[PDB]
Amino acid sequence: TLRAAVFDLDGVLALPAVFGVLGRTEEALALPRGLLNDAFQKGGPEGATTRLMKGEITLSQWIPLMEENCRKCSETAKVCLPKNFSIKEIFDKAISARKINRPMLQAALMLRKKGFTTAILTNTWLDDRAERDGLAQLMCELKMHFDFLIESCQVGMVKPEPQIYKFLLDTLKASPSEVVFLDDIGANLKPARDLGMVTILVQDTDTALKELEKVTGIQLLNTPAPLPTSCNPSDMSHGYVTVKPRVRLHFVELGSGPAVCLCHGFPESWYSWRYQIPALAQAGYRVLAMDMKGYGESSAPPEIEEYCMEVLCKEMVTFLDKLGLSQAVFIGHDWGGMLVWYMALFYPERVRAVASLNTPFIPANPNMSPLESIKANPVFDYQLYFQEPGVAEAELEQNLSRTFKSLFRASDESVLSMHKVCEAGGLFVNSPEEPSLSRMVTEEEIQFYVQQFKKSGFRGPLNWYRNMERNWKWACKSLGRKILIPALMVTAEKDFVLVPQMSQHMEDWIPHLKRGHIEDCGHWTQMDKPTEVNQILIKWLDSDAR
Amino acid sequence: TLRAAVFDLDGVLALPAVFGVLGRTEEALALPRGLLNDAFQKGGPEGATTRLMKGEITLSQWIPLMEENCRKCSETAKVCLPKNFSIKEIFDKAISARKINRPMLQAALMLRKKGFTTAILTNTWLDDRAERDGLAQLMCELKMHFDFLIESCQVGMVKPEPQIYKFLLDTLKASPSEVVFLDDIGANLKPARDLGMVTILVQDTDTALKELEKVTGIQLLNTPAPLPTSCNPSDMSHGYVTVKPRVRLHFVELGSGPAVCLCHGFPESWYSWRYQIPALAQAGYRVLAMDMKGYGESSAPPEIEEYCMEVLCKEMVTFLDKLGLSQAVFIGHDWGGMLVWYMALFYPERVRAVASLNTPFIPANPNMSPLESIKANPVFDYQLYFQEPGVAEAELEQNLSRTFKSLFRASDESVLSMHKVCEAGGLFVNSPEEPSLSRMVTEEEIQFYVQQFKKSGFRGPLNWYRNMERNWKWACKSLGRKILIPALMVTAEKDFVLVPQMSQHMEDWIPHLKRGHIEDCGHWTQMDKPTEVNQILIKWLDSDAR
Ligand SMILES: C[C@H]1C[C@@H](CO)C[C@@H](CN)C1
Ligand SMILES: C[C@H]1C[C@@H](CO)C[C@@H](CN)C1
């Protein structure tokens, strides 16, 4: 009975294979056939390549030794290599061209999801080339999805030596019968099979995956599009900045490149960006996923005025100041989306670009009190219910698991009637005591929000809605301004509170505004349509925010 | 009696003045004299410039309005502006050219050090230009050194209106008699003087500073070279990464750009880099100042083996993995310097560049046990005293304040006889019970190390010295390798343990090695010679690690 899957890197998890380029280069340069491949193989277990693969020497020390035995191979073959000929150039290009074999990684992901222990077992080198970062990034993206990465150059052992195989079984804590091993080299497959391991010779991916699924009894080929990589809270770098004596801001941080500050809505968490964090980091950005004031590990002072837009925005400017960031791209959703437009209007020098999910930018009406405006829209009734301090806190804090289970639902799953929330007496009066689990969230994901909300409750979050008049007066100071920095408005088709229609006049105040639209998407945009969100944000970031 | 100093930005804390360019441009373009300056001034309190300065409109909305009144000014003057003429270009160049007036900032720093409340009061705009980041960075570097920054466009008030002055006194919580106000505009100086404020008209800096010192009674001109900006621990972004179930790593983080990982020595802290952190961040780098395993807010497991180089290096690789960093520049001192060379030998793909302060790279002698090698050097006797678990912990933990006061001393201040530490019975047997305070450290800085060491003590730190044999066996696997990535070796003239001479054969293993040398510098390199350290590291970073 299988419980572990092992994959080679070259020709298996990454394609095209690097050694296959030795053949390509000799065919392109009309050199004798295997000439370059024999030079690579020179000395076998005692040669330069084995010393390199065992970690005795680095790739840059190996380059001239490959060059010396490239001559020796051509000397006997009674030929001569050209004047342009460079091993460095050949390997630089080969390594750069080699990309992740996505269906192979997906199969490894599905196996790990079904309970398998997964590992990468590879014959590799210590890369000290000036271009080494390319491979560093690939190994980083790859390794994250596996329980173990075993590198020949780190363990001082090599395939096909039988010691690396015994090292593999020892690392896996499993007998050879419990293990599937995939390799593109028959010679490297042989010792694994010799111990009684299920072995797959990998030529084309599809056949290898058909063999993989037949042997494991798990569908790996033609399976539905998987969800983007999520975040395990305990595997993140957690950051904390004191913005004022009584206020500390918490954030999760991942990646390098331009700073991208993610701002969640009500009643959320940094975790609402779980599907965007690895994606944006992988796209070449430094992600800072906030716990907005009043939430999770961030401070939650009780005073209403502490949550007015002016104070919240000033604190986000201090947050940048204390981190030593002159700018950040600001991406917000719901209440975070509103803050993000206000950061753009009042602090354009600190905002590299601005993006909003669902939240439109609507200039304040100076000839109408905000309470009249909220009253004018039937869907905004819940906001009037949120005004009296203590009432909504009592209902929302009563049963946390029920609160998030009731709120976090797809467009085709609602249990919440937004109509006449005040007259009905509350948000969940028509909702079951034990709501069913939404298709968007696991029981584990609900419990993270439950645990987060046990710290400070709903007072701070609800206070974001309790500064309508203060926010309106502040917003009126910006009535003569336009948003002229790069901006993106993302609308969600089925958000019945933050309707796409509400964003239709935005080009009057943001003339160069770019857009994104998500069909069959409810209010909880990031978890509802994670793949589409990431596609829209990455495309916009690479074009307008770099 | 004065207790507050207020400075203008343009023509005072930053030079050359931006409006002075209106004159330069008309003189260069042979336009009528004041033509461009009158266009800027058009409408006075009701004009576009006042609307801009009060924050009613943004700089990009203002540009075409300045252009319209540039014509109106030339219409009456019976002239015509050329076809190349661009206000955007003129202001882009003017803002870019404007740099911090260093002696003015130094005077403000000295005043704040002597107990003054300091503030920047400026007539500025909301910058939404594509080039806005340049000014964002300048404001960021400037603001940090002041108690308050008052911007006309944020407060909706402007100089010379008397309301901004009353707002200033209210912000300062001081009467006009307690305040010095510096401005390059006589008209803007007038209302401050009208309230009874000491006023300085700023033309040339030196005269303004002579006036400043006469009026405050504090020497500001011709004063010694100040120390680089330090770190206040409570104003930093604190980061935490779990590298394995029982191990969490703490770090301080500042800036944007390539990641620079700072690794302290024994018995230190992230705080040992206090003078490098703001400097390196200001030079365009993302600084990550570690609490190395066993120190401060990082985990300190008791087991000796947890502190062998192999484990420590693997954990630093996991640290990069969890932060989403494919590489970092590694800069180490003392034990951190040793780790940093091992990161380069075993993980060259993860190290962008490597720099060491004091610690040389010496390949392991495979024909000599490490205990024989340590015995062969009289200065390394203290290391043999550190071998027996508990002994050095008892002496070092006995009185923490005495420990750091005894250790952290300049070359001309030693109280510690490194000769025969074992035979003498300990490190401090010849040391006073109440050592004098070194010129390198304040009493406050000693107490931070004292507070840090109260958490875990000296067991984990001393364990770094307790893996000689384990480290030697691991190092022998790298005996055939060379360090071929960018590298810097910084020697300290007066380090009597890590002597410059010990680094003389490094070019044999690191052929492209770059060097730095610090004269009259002891073991505590970073705090002993902070200015020189920063100069050497910044120059090397900008040339080899970018
Ligand atoms: C009570 C919730 C309902 C939610 C839409 O289901 C929107 C959210 C934030 N505006 C408030
Ligand atoms: C006991 C201290 C003395 C110090 C030099 O004063 C060096 C340090 C780390 N090698 C150990």
From Swiss-Prot, chains A, B:
Q: Where is the PTM N6-acetyllysine found along the chain?
A: K42, K190, K214
Region: Epoxide hydrolase, residue numbers: 234-546
Q: Which UniProt keywords apply?
A: Acetylation, Aromatic hydrocarbons catabolism, Cytoplasm, Detoxification, Hydrolase, Lipid metabolism, Lipoprotein, Magnesium, Metal-binding, Multifunctional enzyme, Peroxisome, Phosphoprotein
Protein modification: The N-terminus is blocked. The covalent modification of cysteine by 15-deoxy-Delta12,14-prostaglandin-J2 is autocatalytic and reversible. It may occur as an alternative to other cysteine modifications, such as S-nitrosylation and S-palmitoylation.
* Ranges where the AB hydrolase-1 domain occurs: 258-530
Cellular localisation? Cytoplasm; Peroxisome
Q: Which residues carry this modification: Phosphoserine?
A: S369
Q: What is its main location?
A: cytoplasm
Record-level GO cellular component terms: cytosol; extracellular exosome; peroxisomal matrix; peroxisome
Which residue ranges are recorded for the region named Phosphatase?
A: 1-223
Catalytic activity annotated for this protein? an epoxide + H2O = an ethanediol; (9S,10S)-10-hydroxy-9-(phosphooxy)octadecanoate + H2O = (9S,10S)-9,10-dihydroxyoctadecanoate + phosphate; 12-phosphooxy-(9Z)-octadecenoate + H2O = 12-hydroxy-(9Z)-octadecenoate + phosphate; 12-phosphooxy-(9E)-octadecenoate + H2O = 12-hydroxy-(9E)-octadecenoate + phosphate
Could you name the active-site residues?
A: D334 (nucleophile), Y465 (proton donor), H523 (proton acceptor)
Q: Which GO terms describe its molecular function?
A: 10-hydroxy-9-(phosphonooxy)octadecanoate phosphatase activity; epoxide hydrolase activity; lipid phosphatase activity; lysophosphatidic acid phosphatase activity; magnesium ion binding; phosphatase activity; protein homodimerization activity; toxic substance binding
What residues bind phosphate, as annotated? T122, N123
Q: What is the effect of changing D8A?
A: Loss of phosphatase activity
Task: Check the record and name the SUPFAM superfamilies matching this protein.
Answer: alpha/beta-Hydrolases, HAD-like
InterPro entries cross-referenced by the UniProt entry: AB_hydrolase_1, AB_hydrolase_fold, Epox_hydrolase-like, HAD-like_sf, HAD-SF_hydro_IA, HAD-SF_ppase_IA/epoxid_hydro_N, HAD_sf, PGP-like_dom2
Q: What is the effect of changing C521S?
A: Loss of S-(15-deoxy-Delta12,14-prostaglandin J2-9-yl)cysteine-induced inhibition of epoxide hydrolase activity
Q: Say where the lipid (S-(15-deoxy-Delta12,14-prostaglandin J2-9-yl)cysteine) is covalently attached.
A: C521
Q: What does this protein's UniProt record list under function?
A: Bifunctional enzyme. The C-terminal domain has epoxide hydrolase activity and acts on epoxides (alkene oxides, oxiranes) and arene oxides. Plays a role in xenobiotic metabolism by degrading potentially toxic epoxides. Also determines steady-state levels of physiological mediators. Bifunctional enzyme. The N-terminal domain has lipid phosphatase activity, with the highest activity towards threo-9,10-phosphonooxy-hydroxy-octadecanoic acid, followed by erythro-9,10-phosphonooxy-hydroxy-octadecanoic acid, 12-phosphonooxy-octadec-9Z-enoic acid and 12-phosphonooxy-octadec-9E-enoic acid. Has phosphatase activity toward lyso-glycerophospholipids with also some lower activity toward lysolipids of sphingolipid and isoprenoid phosphates.
UniProt note: domains: The N-terminal domain has phosphatase activity. The C-terminal domain has epoxide hydrolase activity.
Subunit info here reads: Homodimer.
Q: What is this protein called?
A: Bifunctional epoxide hydrolase 2
Name its species.
Homo sapiens (Human)
